[PDB]
């Protein structure tokens, strides 16, 4: 799994308040966060099925 | 079918003089229907749709309906603030929701 | 600006379509209000997927044809008025051009007789039209300026009544739909068209909800 | 948008069924709430297993027969519009295509006898529908492109009046069942279905509180 | 859901709100519904102070009017997963001469299979794959309605023959009573083979139990009437 296939990471999650949007009844948050993962050389790696 | 004229021209024991036609009996009639839902409320009126908005009141939202819809069929708000519509049911007889 | 409040479908509340008045030549607004029937309909709103048709119950065919010319750009142009007006009886042919009607990006004198010289502005090339009244009788006579390279195809000789072709709008926030409604300067006055549009809204997961309504036009003369 | 509120069955509070009005080409959605009747009978409120049936009882049989064509993608289609009218008495055929109910995915030139061509829509593979009509007789003809592999299935020719496949809801929180109700742009007025329904309910446990009542579609036109 | 106050057994205040016709109360059904029913005992079971009510309620079904049917029933059999066919022709004798429409209600039909209606009394049924058991669908011969079951036998011997529902009935096991407050609940199942009109007749038998473990019976009648529209 060390050189089949990588696991990116860019930025852990983030947590914003929204002004605009919240209407003074429903304050309302945002969330996100990025991140990605590619195989490499998918060589070293086999699959067992019945 | 809610008066018959027969039953009004005999209580009032008006049916020999033509001076009460049957037109102006009928505008009498009439009168008597709007102002007995009028004083005590109990719509003698046909199925209408109100389009109205409504105005926010005090800080928990009194919504006051202009035409009392139905009894229990769920009044739909949309606009103002409000992102999504919603649907309410409300109050039998009175409008205070 | 006509504005019309929409039955809401809910089993509530003379002639079935509602009405529209127009005066020859004018170029109004309308605006329907499809609030009580869509707002409790919860979805996205109304959507730009609407279809308006023309029909006539009433046209009273015209008495006077139109008539159609080509011509290049800059290179004057000149036509007749006479073979343009059928009479079934005999009577003097009081040819005018109204001022109000006129040419848009050129100019036309008239003639005595029947004639008339249509001189395009200079540096002007596309499609101009022009309202002509043979005695009393009002038609239109279309001349298109090419710029001299091949040719130019062929108007659609204007209805009566028309919609424009994309000036339609609506707003999701509200329920309103708003479109033009043009009348020709050539309707008779005393006709009634009837005009039909087909509103779809639309849910939550993308499906259809079809709302169809009709309106009778009543082209009269003085509003 | 109509609502019904049904009864409760409690041996308590003209016709037996309720009025539902109709009108030709509408597709409107109905709200029925079984709050009175299932809210007694604490359990798991509803389940989503209702079930639909329309009956007609009174047809007044179409004059025009419908029809179903086939093509290959990006192939134009021709077809006859003549042979699906048998009239009775010797007259004349104006056909004619509605506008607001024409094809979705093409366009067709309507010939002048019963004769038209439909090309269909650059890269574009399923089903497509557009209604003639045949002296006032309203008829669909059905045309499915294919993406020139095979084939495509035979579209099931759409009721007068039908309820879509998948588009119910019932909330178990508030005992409130919607559904929509289309009619077909073939539906006669005047004439009357029935629409009846069968929801059911659960326990607590597992077992099934079974209810029935029906509607009566009467279609009118103008609304 | 009906509510029924019973009689306290106290030699007054048997009136109540009655506007006196019958004896048996009443209860309107609509064939195809199966509704719940309610009855509380508190007016008779809270002076007998004890152990308050129990299950042990005993139930009855009589008619009182029955008009037979006229089309019969009928019996099918078929191992698991093979495709079944049958006739529908000879499920209605009729003394007059008139055609057979035979319908299959989308409402009745089958529940683990599919059934296509052929042209003349002929129907294929092709039970579900991977299904043992049995399963019924209710025809409609010329307006009078009757119930085809069928059992698919899981391959090995033979299934029982299940005993043709009744018209209405009150089913084995959905019944419960609540000690704490006297009121006894149940089911009132109808089938759709009922005819609008008839009337019968439930008698329901309830028994208390004092403080010790002796009995306090109740007895009481009901006059379910089948009534079409509700």
């Not at chain 1, 996100?32 to 099925?49: K, N, P, S, Y």
């Not at chain 2, 036609?21 to 109100?50: H, M, N, Q, V, W």
Request: proline share 8%.
């Amino acid at each position: 799994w060390k050189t089949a296939f990588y696991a990116v990471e860019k930025r852990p999650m983030f947590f914003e308040q929204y002004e605009g949007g919240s209407s003074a009844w429903c304050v309302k948050y945002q969330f996100g966060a990025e991140d990605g993962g590619f195989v490499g050389c998918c060589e070293h790696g086999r699959i067992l099925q019945i | 079918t809610l008066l018959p004229l027969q039953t009004i021209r005999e209580h009032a024991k008006c049916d020999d003089n033509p001076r009460v036609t049957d037109d102006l009996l009928k505008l009498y009639r009439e009168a008597a229907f709007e102002a007995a839902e009028l004083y005590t409320g109990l719509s003698f009126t046909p199925e209408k749709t109100i389009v109205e908005p409504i105005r926010l009141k005090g800080r928990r939202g009194k919504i006051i309906l202009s035409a009392t819809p139905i009894a229990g069929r769920p009044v739909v708000f949309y606009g103002g603030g409000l992102g999504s519509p919603l649907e309410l049911i409300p109050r039998p007889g009175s409008n205070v929701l | 600006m006509y504005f019309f409040s929409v039955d809401p479908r809910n089993g509530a509340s003379s002639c079935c379509c509602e009405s529209i008045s127009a005066r020859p030549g004018e170029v109004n607004g309308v605006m329907v209000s499809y609030a009580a029937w869509s707002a409790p309909l919860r979805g996205h709103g109304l959507t730009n997927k609407t279809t308006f048709e023309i029909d006539g119950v009433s046209v009273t065919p015209p008495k006077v044809s139109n008539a159609f010319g080509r011509t290049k750009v800059g290179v004057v142009f000149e036509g007749t008025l006479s073979d343009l007006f059928p009479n079934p009886e005999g009577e003097q042919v009081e040819y005018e051009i109204s001022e109000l009607n006129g040419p848009s990006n050129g100019v036309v004198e008239l003639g005595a007789n029947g004639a008339f010289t249509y001189t395009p502005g200079a540096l002007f090339t596309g499609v101009d039209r022009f309202w002509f009244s043979i005695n009393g009788n009002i038609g239109e006579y279309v001349i298109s300026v090419d710029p001299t390279t091949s040719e130019l195809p062929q108007p659609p000789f204007t209805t009566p009544v028309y919609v424009p072709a994309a000036r339609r709008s609506v707003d999701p926030r509200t329920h309103v739909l708003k479109f033009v409604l043009g009348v020709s300067p050539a309707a008779i006055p005393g006709d009634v068209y009837r005009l039909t549009v087909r509103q779809v809204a639309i849910d939550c997961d993308g499906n259809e909800f079809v709302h169809i309504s009709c309106y009778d036009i009543s082209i009269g003369s003085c509003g």
